[PDB]
């Protein structure tokens, strides 16, 4: 259930969603994220990084393979 961030993602400045900061995980390139279950209809994984859980966009991350 591990994914690697291919880009930096700062939801506060980069999210297109109004609740992005509060609901989406911030990460930098090369961070490894713990994903639970599968990606939702919106294209977001539910993930964990540094003691925090939140939505993770699939297009910013790559599954470990």
């Amino acid at each position: 259930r591990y994914f690697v961030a291919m880009f930096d993602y700062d939801p506060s400045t980069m999210s297109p969603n109004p609740d992005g900061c509060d609901e989406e995980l911030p990460f930098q390139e090369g961070d490894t994220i713990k994903v639970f279950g599968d990606k939702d209809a919106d294209g977001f994984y539910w993930g964990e990084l540094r003691g925090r859980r939140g939505y993770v966009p699939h297009n910013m991350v790559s599954e470990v393979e």
């Binding site: 880009f7 930096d8 980069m14 919106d42 939505y55 297009n59």
Partner: peptide
């Protein structure tokens, strides 16, 4: 809920 843009200067 909407997906973010991949920054073009990083891609």
């Amino acid at each position: 809920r909407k997906l973010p843009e991949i920054p073009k200067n990083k891609k």
